[PDB]
Amino acid sequence: LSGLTHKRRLSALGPGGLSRERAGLEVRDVHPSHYGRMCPIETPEGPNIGLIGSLSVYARVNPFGFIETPYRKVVDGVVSDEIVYLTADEEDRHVVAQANSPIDADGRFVEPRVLVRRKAGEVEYVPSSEVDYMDVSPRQMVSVATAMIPFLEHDDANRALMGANMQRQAVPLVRSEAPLVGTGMELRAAIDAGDVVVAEESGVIEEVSADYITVMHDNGTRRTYRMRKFARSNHGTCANQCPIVDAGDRVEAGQVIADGPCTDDGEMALGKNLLVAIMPWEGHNYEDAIILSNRLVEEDVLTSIHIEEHEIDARDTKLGAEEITRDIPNISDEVLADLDERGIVRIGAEVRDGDILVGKVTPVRDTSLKVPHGESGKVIGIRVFSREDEDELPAGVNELVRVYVAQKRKISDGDKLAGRHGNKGVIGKILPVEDMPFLADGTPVDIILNTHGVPRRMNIGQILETHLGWCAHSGWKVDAAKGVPDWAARLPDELLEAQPNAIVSTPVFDGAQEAELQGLLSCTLPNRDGDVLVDADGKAMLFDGRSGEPFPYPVTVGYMYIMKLHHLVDDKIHARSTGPYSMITQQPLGGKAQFGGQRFGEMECWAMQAYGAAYTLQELLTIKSDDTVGRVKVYEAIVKGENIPEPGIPESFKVLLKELQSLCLNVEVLSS
Amino acid sequence: LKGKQGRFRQNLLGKRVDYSGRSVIVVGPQLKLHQCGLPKLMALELFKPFVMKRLVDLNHAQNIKSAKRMVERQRPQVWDVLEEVIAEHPVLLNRAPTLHRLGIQAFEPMLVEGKAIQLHPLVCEAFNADFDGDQMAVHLPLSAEAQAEARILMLSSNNILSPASGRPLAMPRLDMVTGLYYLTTEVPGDTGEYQPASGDHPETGVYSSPAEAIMAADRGVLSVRAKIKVRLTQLRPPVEIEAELFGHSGWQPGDAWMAETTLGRVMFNELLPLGYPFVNKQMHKKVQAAIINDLAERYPMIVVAQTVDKLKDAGFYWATRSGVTVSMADVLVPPRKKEILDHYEERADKVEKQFQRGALNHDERNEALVEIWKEATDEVGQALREHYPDDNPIITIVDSGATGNFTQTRTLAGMKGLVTNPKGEFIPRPVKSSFREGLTVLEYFINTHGARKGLADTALRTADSGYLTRRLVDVSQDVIVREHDCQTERGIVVELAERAPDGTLIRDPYIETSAYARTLGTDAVDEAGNVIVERGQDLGDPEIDALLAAGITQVKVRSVLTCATSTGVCATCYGRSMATGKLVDIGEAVGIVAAQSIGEPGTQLTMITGGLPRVQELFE
Amino acid sequence: NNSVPGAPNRVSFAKLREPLEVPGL
Amino acid sequence: GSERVLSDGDHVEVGQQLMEGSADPHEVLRVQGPREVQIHLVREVQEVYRAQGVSIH
Amino acid sequence: GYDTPLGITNPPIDELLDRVSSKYALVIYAAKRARQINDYYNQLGEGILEYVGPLVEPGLQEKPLSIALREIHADLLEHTE
Amino acid sequence: GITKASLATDSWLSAASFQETTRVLTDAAINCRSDKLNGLKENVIIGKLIPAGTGINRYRNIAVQPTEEARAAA
Amino acid sequence: ISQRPTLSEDVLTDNRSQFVIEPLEPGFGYTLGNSLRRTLLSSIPGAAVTSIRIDGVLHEFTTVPGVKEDVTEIILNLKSLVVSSEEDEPVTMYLRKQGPGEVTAGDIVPPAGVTVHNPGMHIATLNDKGKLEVELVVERGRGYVPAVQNRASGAEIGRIPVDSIYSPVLKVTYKVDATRVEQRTDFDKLILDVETKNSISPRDALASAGKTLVELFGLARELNVEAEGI
Amino acid sequence: SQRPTLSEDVLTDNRSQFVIEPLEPGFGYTLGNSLRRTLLSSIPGAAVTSIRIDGVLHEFTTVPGVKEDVTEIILNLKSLVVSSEEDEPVTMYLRKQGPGEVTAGDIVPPAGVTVHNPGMHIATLNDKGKLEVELVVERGRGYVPAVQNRASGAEIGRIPVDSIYSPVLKVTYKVDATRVEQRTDFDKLILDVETKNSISPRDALASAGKTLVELFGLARELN
Ligand SMILES: [Mg+2]
Ligand SMILES: [Zn+2]
């Protein structure tokens, strides 16, 4: 989905365009001519708001570069099946009807007055004859990403935008599952995404394998497809393909054959289905926090794979050429116990932080490449490029070798999660499976959400999604012996009888109404034990896991789709006590990879000054950042039992002196 | 030297320090106020030299290099020493970017698994932090001096009171308030309530002591919130009953009196410090603020922190059982909205025909439409409020001051009403549906504008406030209280409270700010010869009440503006401090505090403009 | 109306018919 | 009273603003001294801050 | 007249302020005593004395600053302005 | 305004830090303006203890010894 | 698996106590705490009063003549009295006095077996020429039982059932604290708190509760044979 | 009036109901919750610890002839359930070659261990490839991360696997109260437990009972 959205993006800045400071603020706002061409919801949250849109679902660029949009022209008040494409100017000069306005099966307008859009920001009823154009589908103004957010007609603009932006940050899991409730624009958005193979001609599969497939065409031509397995994605995640076809099936042309990352039977699946409950629970879910059952951790429900990537090179120098070699000066045999004869780590050897990954000698010194601070995992593959074998390399290099390290991450504390309605959060605590509240039949819940954040943020759509998810999961059977209930008049005749773990889809702007949910929730199939858990309203009776006594009031439950964001915790966490020092500034390095300390802004200096704290500021400015002898002496004193000696003169001040004395300004000290 | 990279400037932008660390923050309700959680994988790597020294002292290793190697390998012999070496070693937290004085606390560490720096719920407001991925650094003082510094001055339990105004900031904030509201609420005709003697049957609903009441509630014959007549023994009764029943002889522990309240109120009062008079009213957020302010103004800080912690724990415990959820059956549609909408639409059609006659122009049509639809929205909101009972979770949440307002509920259930436009003027097209029922494509398209504009407004406001704060800090760097008393006489006079021509006395609506903490210049002797507040005695809540009782209106108060000190200001002129609760101590910087306090609220300053640019122009 | 040959079957709360398939994305 | 209109022939106190707006601090300073301008600045800033609902000493 | 606290907040802050003139003096008035205590501990293998050792009997491996603060609360130190 | 009130100060080092470093540096150089380390900004640029809070000389020089009564009773 | 033994510490006060159990396997904190609290609160047998009688009053609306206190105050004062009985059958007890003065529990004549553990407790006060006769019955039971469960009781003139307290303990509270026995650093540390009447000591009430709970789980264990740690 | 409780069993195919009464009022809930808590986490069992696949050096790869890669087969094998009689790491074998299907019943367990669900589907093989996998079976209780074998410093051919020793699957209870004014005020507990077929419900209930008895024995001793 992220790749498709990036391919469909519409930038407005860059070379040949306006800058951030000069571009006006009005341009970042909507314009009544955006309907049908550029989605108004999807947009980056950062300062680049309004400058980066996205094509509409049905928009197609005319041969000149003016976006178009389909319409069917009403000739004499009768809808026309044939369609034409109109640009902005021609669209203004006509009357455009409303898709949702009821229309008879014969093409006759049941209503005499039908709302309409006019020249600019004008809408008003008009007789049912002069109307000239009518739209095609209600989903004609949404982007591709926003088109797959169920119950989009109930959320808020900001919340919908946040959810749309969140959907582009999922992480492919190990065992994906299709959502129970999602629009009908999932499989189509996956087939065109390119990351899933598909047969060209209708043939019959002879044999299949985990690494390759062989399909026999009806004309007698055998063809083979190779599927890349565990190849590092462009952004650090993994990508695979697992064929979903059996040996001896006549697969028709255009039928998916393999599922790539975030896919399940040829349709998008960015997350799993978890049983949610909405109630404040001992403040652990206080202010957007989240609680997860240990069942997720111990069942790999939300386990992901991340593949790192490193490379070292031996480039020629004036003093000589460097060569990768197993031997390395003054190193114990144990340290290099992993490197092979050629001087590289054998495949499939566990590597820990600070370990040596590939050895080389510098004309001889030691400058071998080592794992950075905070990495681990297996070594899945090593690629070595040699100039001897006639392999193109950048000028001035002889041997560039890259090593891939793959680590399996299980969801832990401090990880982000978010639904499709833009409700972020963090895993506050992962309680044991024996402590979570459980339904009356012994089914412990998997995640608990706070309730105070629902009505203030005003994203009531997710409640309806949860209700519909539970209804679909449990399966329903609406009574029809006495006849279709009035509330069930418009239901498709084939949607009255479902099975457990059924699948449902609600297209945006045209989905189940409140009456539909009210009716459905009253006819869910009973559990195998013979009893129904939830009431008509959708709430249920729980049982506290700690106290063991039931809660005084019922609570809401249901299955809600949950994704997993890319802002993991292992990347963030980092510590630094003593390590490499920069040579030009005499300050500790920066960044997690380099094992460097944190920044100390001036606002912290102001805060320290406010408290009246002086010695702490003196330390932070002199004894832990600049003073070399100060650092050495304090470290030695700490290692022993001696008191910390008072700091000295910072390097910054001495540099300032020795620099200002160069402009003939004799800067004395006057110690007296 | 000149320019942004000039070595003069770059010496102030800060340096990269050692003994640091950053991680995500997750709320933890199991900690005391002066506590914090550090993952062991971070604590062990941040205390390495101390651990090595203490370990070599215990003879688990032979030298320093071997000890360092063992610490690197993380043998099971290290964790005991790690726990023994951080007994009382404070650390400094700093949410990035720090804004005000309370943005750098100093908590005691505590080992806990995971990879997230746990925290206390009541301090998140100090950092303005939200538990959705925020990151804060963690420093550590080394010398024996910085330890005492961060243990006495920068400790968290000693900074309950915000520097802006001398009123506590760390108070029950978002969720636990709902729990307290549910606990202290009263309901009539509950189970086990008090009843009068009905002929041959005694009067039931009287319990010997709170222990029996708790046991009965546990058994299941007494709802936690019902009218009861308990017999308390360790809670001073309200003054109105203390002065009557005991004749002012003075209550002491061990004296009984028959109260009339609900068990929830007793269980809540048991949390308050001993000796505090009984409080017997439903706890709206305003009442919570009043109680906390009174406790902070009558008792030492440590007792306030302890009672706040206990109250937060009780609120968290009782919030879960309040049965506050969300469902379709809770967001209830108005019953007769359709008729009102039809009538107002008919009147709109009337004005539409009026315009069709051509007498009026476009502007008058816009004005008529906007006013009509504003009236319609108000009427629909009134009807919706009249519809909901006092049991829906939305009403319980909104009315108890936990969060939000009624307009959001009206949008969620009633009508969203007219919406802004990119030009700022109200579109003549109003939305006729609520988010529950379901919008349509045109209405959502129209609605997008407000969200876009609000995002842009916040984006500019953050930077504006930052720049203003930086400049204000720059201007006033060198103000410091040097001398203890300038012994000057000029004191600005401020009208405390005006006396109405018909009434006896009306409290000035701004006495809370002008003359609340300043030092009284001259004694405000009453009309008679008696002295109610003597010269020099700092003012405060009880003293302000005493002054109001005396009916005094005009008072001359010592001020810093007319201070006679050559450099800085005299301490006596400055008056009662903010974070300390007492007179400022010699040497304390005041310029930085003032700059931070004035600059912090700049974030919410929005629109001769009235917003932040107005303040910029005024100061400039 | 599953245009692709063997997509999974998931009935939908359909009320109006779109007269054209989504063009190649 | 604020509802009253600016009636000609009346009398006013020194330093008062005749019409809505803001008085230049330099003029009030020169015609009143430092005390009046100080108190006016304090009151004006306090008013603009009290407009938003925030409170500071 | 209140529940005994636990952790580093014992003894409380207000009790100390009754002894010391102002909170800014107390920090140094205790840090210097902590330095003296650490110096006394360091000369423990052989006996060279400049100041006496803890006055109040310490705990089980308590930090010197804690001892200093817990003995200042007992009114056992005299200092020069 | 704040800008004009802050641009004119007594210490030359802070003034050079703020704006027009070359001009103020030259003016201070000609006069041989020797300034005491007063204030916070210059005193923190140098690195010496700030003259505020626990830095004022009234507190930095304190001698504390156990009372004779305690010494008599060990 | 033996794991590590869990020892029960103890603290002492006038009549309260803070029993501490440390350390426990992760999650066993509440598993002990809640059940132990419930057993302590409503398992230990005891004795208390059930009904009273006042021949000087016909019903409860009014107050007994010649006495400062009210009927409800008399009931409340007489309910808190601590009575220990060793006989199963419900025995009677009489309180009688004449003339001005006060009345104390110690002045009530006890029959064989029953005893009162607080003689100095106050009940009420009489004015001059005052008299009151009471015939209160005492029964042995467990836990708390309200008077509503004793409503239908034969037919009498002035039978006024009172909510009894069949337990020597009346307050219990507990928490859980984290502990570090190894790199796990999540082991629970139960902190119990009990405050009993004068008829039992906390260390004995807890012992009796443990006896009862172990006897109860003996049924679960006896179904088969299988061992575990200490 | 006062009788000791008694526990009886109501049997079903694999999930049994236990009825306990009479219990004093307001006491059934806590006992049921305590039993449930001690049942779902402290029941000893055995499960696969680490596997050894011939011709494969790690887990992020495939093997010719199979339809799913190593990760999928590891996930499938996680569902395997085994009971250990010996208290030491035992070794099994799994040799299947040629086209067809490989199920749980193709393992040749040694003496003292058994596989109770031979119907599980592990994977499928094309005629090109074969398969020979060796796996360990250790006895533990609770749940242990797979990384435990990472620090053992074995050879390359060892692949750690997460171990989950728990035979219990679901437990629930309901209380049938009798709140009549008579002294017959008690409650009847109805506890239901279902196991993974490794051990019958009676054995798990007895183990939990013994665990709680041994734990509470520390209080009955006079203090
Ligand atoms: Mg945040
Ligand atoms: Zn002064």
Residue numbers in the entry:
A (entry chain c): 446 to 808, 832 to 1140
B (entry chain d): 406 to 1012, 1024 to 1036
C (entry chain c): 29 to 53
D (entry chain d): 1094 to 1150
E (entry chain e): 28 to 108
F (entry chain d): 1209 to 1282
G (entry chain b): 3 to 232
H (entry chain a): 4 to 226
Task: Provide the publication's sentences verbatim.
In bacteria, transcription is carried out by the RNA polymerase (RNAP) core (E) composed of five subunits (α_2_ββ’ω). To initiate transcription, the core associates with the promoter-specific initiation factor σ (the σ subunit) to form the RNAP holoenzyme (Eσ). Most Mtb genes are transcribed by RNAP harboring the principal σ^A^ subunit and the principal-like σ^B^ subunit that belong to group I and group II, respectively, and share almost identical promoter binding regions. Here, we show that the stress-response σ^B^ factor from the human pathogen, *Mycobacterium tuberculosis*, induces the RNAP holoenzyme oligomerization into a supramolecular complex composed of eight RNAP units.
Analysis of the cryo-EM images revealed two particle populations: RNAP monomers and O-shaped RNAP oligomers (**[Fig fig1]**). We determined the RNAP monomer structure at a nominal resolution of 4.1 Å (**Figure S1-S2, [Table tbl1]**). In the cryo-EM map of the monomer, the σ^B^ subunit density was absent. Overall, the structure was similar to the published structure of the *Mycobacterium smegmatis* RNAP core (conformation 2) with a ~5 Å bigger distance between the RNAP β lobe 1 (β-L275) and β’ clamp (β’-R214) domains. The β flap density was absent in our Mtb RNAP core structure and in the published cryo-EM structures of *M. smegmatis* RNAP core and holoenzyme.
